[PDB]
Amino acid sequence: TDNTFVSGNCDVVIGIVNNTVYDPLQPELDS
Amino acid sequence: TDNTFVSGNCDVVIGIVNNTVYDPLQPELDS
């Protein structure tokens, strides 16, 4: 999430793909 | 905080206004 940024949804961009964003806040909450 | 950065104070800036900053750690820590 620090290298990328969010804008809109995935129903507009042509050629868009799916992946998993490694949010660094997630393992900090679980620690 | 991902779109702004802190510096100085609200006394030196001419024409500054008041607002509220969405802290991404606030809802994540509460959740």
Side-chain angles (χ1 to χ4, degrees):
Chain A
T1 58
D2 300 328
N3 299 334
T4 61
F5 67 99
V6 177
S7 177
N9 51 15
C10 287
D11 299 327
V12 184
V13 180
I14 295 164
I16 196 165
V17 306
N18 302 326
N19 208 252
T20 303
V21 172
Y22 293 84
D23 188 7
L25 303 174
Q26 181 61 19
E28 297 293 348
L29 296 169
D30 302 330
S31 181
Chain B
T1 57
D2 302 330
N3 296 333
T4 60
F5 62 97
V6 178
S7 186
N9 49 19
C10 282
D11 300 329
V12 302
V13 182
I14 293 164
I16 197 166
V17 306
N18 302 326
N19 210 265
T20 302
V21 177
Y22 171 78
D23 188 7
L25 303 175
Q26 178 58 22
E28 295 291 351
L29 290 167
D30 300 332
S31 181

XYZ file of all heavy atoms in Angstrom:
466
model
N 0.807 -1.213 0.000
C 0.000 0.000 0.000
C 0.843 1.267 0.000
O 0.330 2.329 -0.369
C -0.932 0.014 1.213
O -0.157 -0.078 2.416
C -1.913 -1.147 1.153
N 2.112 1.185 0.403
C 2.994 2.344 0.392
C 3.602 2.601 -0.978
O 3.912 3.752 -1.304
C 4.115 2.161 1.420
C 3.589 2.001 2.833
O 2.532 2.586 3.146
O 4.237 1.290 3.631
N 3.783 1.553 -1.785
C 4.311 1.718 -3.134
C 3.222 2.082 -4.136
O 3.510 2.743 -5.139
C 5.016 0.438 -3.581
C 6.198 0.084 -2.699
O 6.798 0.954 -2.069
N 6.538 -1.198 -2.652
N 1.982 1.668 -3.883
C 0.853 1.900 -4.771
C -0.144 2.842 -4.107
O -0.009 3.207 -2.937
C 0.162 0.582 -5.140
O -0.329 -0.053 -3.952
C 1.131 -0.354 -5.846
N -1.154 3.240 -4.881
C -2.231 4.082 -4.385
C -3.535 3.658 -5.046
O -3.545 3.081 -6.134
C -1.953 5.573 -4.639
C -1.951 5.957 -6.093
C -3.066 6.539 -6.672
C -0.828 5.751 -6.877
C -3.065 6.900 -8.004
C -0.823 6.110 -8.211
C -1.943 6.686 -8.775
N -4.640 3.961 -4.368
C -5.970 3.508 -4.767
C -6.694 4.640 -5.478
O -6.579 5.811 -5.092
C -6.777 3.022 -3.546
C -8.190 2.629 -3.963
C -6.065 1.856 -2.869
N -7.443 4.291 -6.525
C -8.253 5.270 -7.246
C -9.331 4.514 -8.012
O -9.019 3.796 -8.968
C -7.391 6.105 -8.185
O -8.181 7.014 -8.932
N -10.585 4.672 -7.595
C -11.678 4.024 -8.290
C -11.777 2.541 -7.965
O -11.330 2.063 -6.916
N -12.382 1.810 -8.897
C -12.610 0.374 -8.787
C -12.028 -0.331 -10.011
O -11.553 0.304 -10.956
C -14.104 0.074 -8.632
C -14.955 0.760 -9.687
O -14.443 1.244 -10.697
N -16.261 0.803 -9.455
N -12.075 -1.662 -9.983
C -11.518 -2.493 -11.042
C -12.536 -2.838 -12.128
O -12.331 -3.805 -12.869
C -10.929 -3.773 -10.435
S -9.382 -3.487 -9.551
N -13.613 -2.061 -12.249
C -14.623 -2.256 -13.282
C -14.495 -1.268 -14.437
O -15.403 -1.200 -15.272
C -16.023 -2.148 -12.671
C -16.281 -3.204 -11.614
O -15.749 -4.325 -11.749
O -17.017 -2.912 -10.647
N -13.400 -0.510 -14.505
C -13.201 0.523 -15.519
C -11.904 0.298 -16.291
O -11.877 0.396 -17.518
C -13.228 1.932 -14.883
C -13.126 3.008 -15.963
C -14.490 2.118 -14.044
N -10.816 0.001 -15.582
C -9.508 -0.135 -16.219
C -9.512 -1.375 -17.103
O -9.790 -2.487 -16.640
C -8.390 -0.203 -15.172
C -7.029 -0.339 -15.852
C -8.424 1.026 -14.267
N -9.200 -1.188 -18.383
C -9.132 -2.293 -19.333
C -7.772 -2.967 -19.190
O -6.746 -2.293 -19.060
C -9.359 -1.807 -20.774
C -10.786 -1.267 -20.942
C -9.094 -2.945 -21.762
C -10.986 -0.418 -22.188
N -7.765 -4.298 -19.215
C -6.543 -5.057 -19.061
C -6.077 -5.232 -17.631
O -4.996 -5.797 -17.416
N -6.852 -4.770 -16.651
C -6.448 -4.866 -15.255
C -6.449 -6.326 -14.824
O -7.154 -7.164 -15.402
C -7.383 -4.015 -14.379
C -6.770 -3.787 -12.995
C -8.761 -4.672 -14.265
C -7.450 -2.688 -12.208
N -5.650 -6.636 -13.802
C -5.475 -7.996 -13.307
C -5.717 -8.008 -11.802
O -5.973 -6.976 -11.180
C -4.081 -8.564 -13.640
C -3.801 -8.449 -15.132
C -3.001 -7.857 -12.830
N -5.628 -9.204 -11.224
C -5.833 -9.428 -9.800
C -4.532 -9.874 -9.143
O -3.722 -10.583 -9.744
C -6.917 -10.484 -9.572
C -8.240 -10.105 -10.206
O -8.599 -8.929 -10.267
N -8.972 -11.102 -10.687
N -4.341 -9.447 -7.899
C -3.147 -9.789 -7.132
C -3.474 -9.605 -5.653
O -4.629 -9.368 -5.283
C -1.953 -8.937 -7.582
C -0.625 -9.637 -7.375
O 0.148 -9.279 -6.486
N -0.358 -10.651 -8.189
N -2.455 -9.726 -4.801
C -2.587 -9.550 -3.360
C -1.655 -8.433 -2.919
O -0.442 -8.509 -3.139
C -2.259 -10.847 -2.615
O -3.113 -11.898 -3.080
C -2.447 -10.667 -1.113
N -2.220 -7.402 -2.298
C -1.448 -6.274 -1.790
C -1.003 -6.592 -0.370
O -1.833 -6.869 0.505
C -2.274 -4.976 -1.834
C -1.530 -3.847 -1.131
C -2.587 -4.590 -3.273
N 0.309 -6.549 -0.138
C 0.883 -6.861 1.170
C 0.883 -5.588 2.006
O 1.849 -4.825 2.020
C 2.284 -7.439 1.014
C 2.303 -8.799 0.354
C 2.288 -8.922 -1.028
C 2.335 -9.960 1.115
C 2.303 -10.163 -1.636
C 2.350 -11.206 0.516
C 2.335 -11.302 -0.858
O 2.350 -12.539 -1.458
N -0.220 -5.361 2.715
C -0.361 -4.189 3.567
C 0.540 -4.350 4.793
O 0.350 -5.303 5.558
C -1.819 -4.015 3.996
C -2.063 -2.708 4.732
O -1.139 -1.873 4.802
O -3.188 -2.517 5.243
N 1.526 -3.472 5.029
C 2.372 -3.645 6.223
C 1.638 -3.435 7.538
O 2.162 -3.837 8.584
C 3.476 -2.598 6.032
C 2.872 -1.570 5.163
C 1.977 -2.317 4.227
N 0.451 -2.823 7.524
C -0.301 -2.642 8.761
C -0.875 -3.958 9.272
O -1.156 -4.083 10.469
C -1.428 -1.631 8.547
C -1.032 -0.242 8.039
C -2.271 0.583 7.733
C -0.154 0.480 9.049
N -1.054 -4.948 8.389
C -1.674 -6.204 8.811
C -0.815 -6.967 9.812
O -1.320 -7.287 10.903
C -2.016 -7.049 7.577
C -2.685 -8.393 7.868
C -4.014 -8.249 8.587
O -4.626 -7.182 8.576
N -4.466 -9.328 9.217
N 0.456 -7.296 9.536
C 1.235 -8.039 10.541
C 1.517 -7.248 11.806
O 1.799 -7.858 12.844
C 2.533 -8.384 9.800
C 2.645 -7.367 8.736
C 1.240 -7.081 8.307
N 1.449 -5.915 11.759
C 1.662 -5.125 12.967
C 0.493 -5.274 13.932
O 0.690 -5.318 15.152
C 1.873 -3.655 12.603
C 3.105 -3.387 11.746
C 4.408 -3.654 12.479
O 4.377 -3.832 13.714
O 5.466 -3.686 11.814
N -0.731 -5.355 13.406
C -1.892 -5.565 14.263
C -1.896 -6.963 14.868
O -2.324 -7.140 16.014
C -3.179 -5.331 13.471
C -3.409 -3.916 12.938
C -4.574 -3.902 11.960
C -3.654 -2.934 14.076
N -1.427 -7.960 14.121
C -1.382 -9.334 14.606
C -0.219 -9.595 15.555
O -0.220 -10.626 16.236
C -1.298 -10.301 13.422
C -2.463 -10.153 12.464
O -3.563 -9.771 12.918
O -2.282 -10.417 11.257
N 0.763 -8.700 15.623
C 1.901 -8.880 16.514
C 1.508 -8.583 17.957
O 2.107 -9.105 18.898
C 3.061 -7.978 16.089
O 4.181 -8.152 16.941
N -2.836 11.480 6.122
C -1.387 11.560 6.257
C -0.664 11.064 5.013
O 0.472 11.482 4.765
C -0.923 10.757 7.474
O -1.370 9.399 7.356
C -1.470 11.363 8.758
N -1.288 10.183 4.232
C -0.690 9.705 2.993
C -0.681 10.757 1.892
O 0.060 10.595 0.917
C -1.435 8.462 2.500
C -1.426 7.335 3.513
O -0.452 7.239 4.290
O -2.393 6.545 3.535
N -1.479 11.822 2.026
C -1.549 12.895 1.042
C -0.997 14.224 1.538
O -0.872 15.152 0.733
C -3.003 13.106 0.593
C -3.570 11.904 -0.135
O -2.832 11.126 -0.740
N -4.886 11.747 -0.081
N -0.672 14.341 2.826
C -0.136 15.564 3.405
C 1.054 15.225 4.294
O 1.304 14.061 4.617
C -1.198 16.318 4.217
O -1.666 15.488 5.287
C -2.372 16.714 3.332
N 1.792 16.263 4.685
C 2.919 16.120 5.594
C 2.943 17.306 6.546
O 2.496 18.407 6.214
C 4.251 16.006 4.836
C 4.595 17.215 4.012
C 5.451 18.187 4.505
C 4.077 17.373 2.738
C 5.774 19.295 3.748
C 4.396 18.482 1.977
C 5.245 19.443 2.484
N 3.481 17.066 7.742
C 3.476 18.040 8.827
C 4.778 18.825 8.797
O 5.851 18.267 8.533
C 3.285 17.350 10.191
C 3.331 18.375 11.321
C 1.974 16.574 10.223
N 4.685 20.125 9.073
C 5.861 20.977 9.168
C 5.450 22.305 9.791
O 4.342 22.790 9.553
C 6.501 21.209 7.795
O 7.715 21.930 7.914
N 6.349 22.876 10.587
C 6.087 24.178 11.181
C 4.906 24.131 12.130
O 4.740 23.188 12.911
N 4.072 25.166 12.065
C 2.900 25.274 12.920
C 1.857 26.128 12.209
O 2.104 26.677 11.131
C 3.276 25.850 14.290
C 4.121 27.106 14.185
O 4.160 27.757 13.142
N 4.805 27.448 15.268
N 0.682 26.239 12.827
C -0.450 26.953 12.250
C -0.477 28.435 12.624
O -1.506 29.090 12.422
C -1.751 26.265 12.675
S -2.071 24.764 11.727
N 0.627 28.978 13.139
C 0.729 30.396 13.466
C 1.477 31.199 12.413
O 1.152 32.372 12.198
C 1.429 30.577 14.818
C 0.682 29.906 15.954
O -0.563 29.829 15.887
O 1.341 29.457 16.917
N 2.467 30.596 11.753
C 3.268 31.318 10.767
C 2.599 31.376 9.399
O 2.831 32.332 8.647
C 4.668 30.691 10.621
C 5.395 30.685 11.959
C 4.593 29.273 10.031
N 1.779 30.390 9.051
C 1.169 30.332 7.727
C 0.080 31.393 7.643
O -0.759 31.511 8.544
C 0.605 28.935 7.433
C 0.012 28.887 6.026
C 1.687 27.872 7.599
N 0.091 32.166 6.562
C -0.872 33.241 6.351
C -2.073 32.671 5.607
O -1.932 32.129 4.507
C -0.244 34.408 5.573
C 0.839 35.093 6.417
C -1.324 35.410 5.151
C 1.774 35.989 5.624
N -3.256 32.799 6.205
C -4.478 32.327 5.591
C -4.782 30.862 5.801
O -5.626 30.315 5.081
N -4.126 30.209 6.760
C -4.356 28.791 6.997
C -5.744 28.589 7.597
O -6.313 29.491 8.227
C -3.255 28.224 7.913
C -3.217 26.695 7.835
C -3.458 28.696 9.355
C -1.959 26.092 8.425
N -6.296 27.391 7.397
C -7.635 27.043 7.850
C -7.552 25.806 8.739
O -6.499 25.184 8.884
C -8.607 26.806 6.675
C -8.618 28.007 5.743
C -8.244 25.534 5.918
N -8.690 25.462 9.338
C -8.822 24.303 10.209
C -9.598 23.201 9.499
O -10.520 23.465 8.723
C -9.529 24.681 11.511
C -8.809 25.780 12.267
O -7.581 25.863 12.245
N -9.571 26.634 12.941
N -9.218 21.959 9.772
C -9.857 20.792 9.167
C -9.522 19.582 10.035
O -8.933 19.718 11.115
C -9.406 20.609 7.716
C -10.468 19.957 6.855
O -10.473 18.740 6.669
N -11.380 20.764 6.330
N -9.903 18.395 9.562
C -9.624 17.134 10.240
C -8.915 16.205 9.268
O -9.327 16.080 8.111
C -10.912 16.478 10.753
O -11.593 17.379 11.636
C -10.599 15.184 11.493
N -7.856 15.556 9.745
C -7.017 14.689 8.925
C -7.397 13.242 9.203
O -7.408 12.806 10.361
C -5.524 14.927 9.211
C -4.666 13.958 8.412
C -5.143 16.365 8.889
N -7.710 12.499 8.147
C -8.016 11.081 8.289
C -6.735 10.306 8.565
O -5.880 10.170 7.683
C -8.702 10.556 7.029
C -8.859 9.052 7.007
C -9.861 8.429 7.739
C -8.005 8.255 6.255
C -10.007 7.054 7.723
C -8.144 6.881 6.232
C -9.146 6.285 6.968
O -9.289 4.916 6.947
N -6.606 9.792 9.787
C -5.442 9.011 10.177
C -5.712 7.549 9.843
O -6.636 6.964 10.429
C -5.164 9.175 11.670
C -3.852 8.542 12.095
O -3.091 8.086 11.216
O -3.581 8.501 13.314
N -4.971 6.914 8.927
C -5.275 5.506 8.616
C -5.025 4.559 9.775
O -5.628 3.481 9.814
C -4.350 5.197 7.432
C -3.225 6.141 7.580
C -3.827 7.398 8.130
N -4.158 4.926 10.720
C -3.916 4.089 11.887
C -5.045 4.161 12.906
O -5.128 3.290 13.779
C -2.600 4.488 12.560
C -1.336 4.440 11.698
C -0.148 4.982 12.478
C -1.055 3.027 11.214
N -5.915 5.179 12.822
C -6.989 5.303 13.807
C -8.003 4.170 13.682
O -8.240 3.465 14.677
C -7.633 6.690 13.703
C -8.815 6.935 14.643
C -8.453 6.760 16.105
O -7.286 6.859 16.484
N -9.456 6.497 16.936
N -8.631 3.932 12.523
C -9.581 2.809 12.446
C -8.915 1.448 12.488
O -9.542 0.487 12.951
C -10.293 3.040 11.108
C -9.296 3.748 10.286
C -8.541 4.639 11.230
N -7.669 1.332 12.024
C -6.976 0.049 12.062
C -6.657 -0.369 13.491
O -6.805 -1.544 13.846
C -5.696 0.121 11.229
C -5.928 0.331 9.737
C -6.559 -0.872 9.059
O -6.667 -1.936 9.703
O -6.948 -0.751 7.879
N -6.218 0.576 14.326
C -5.955 0.259 15.726
C -7.244 -0.037 16.481
O -7.255 -0.896 17.369
C -5.201 1.410 16.392
C -3.751 1.624 15.949
C -3.244 2.972 16.432
C -2.851 0.507 16.457
N -8.332 0.660 16.146
C -9.615 0.372 16.776
C -10.165 -0.976 16.333
O -10.827 -1.664 17.118
C -10.617 1.482 16.455
C -10.155 2.840 16.942
O -9.405 2.896 17.937
O -10.546 3.857 16.326
N -9.905 -1.369 15.089
C -10.373 -2.647 14.569
C -9.472 -3.783 15.042
O -9.857 -4.951 15.023
C -10.426 -2.616 13.040
O -10.901 -3.844 12.516
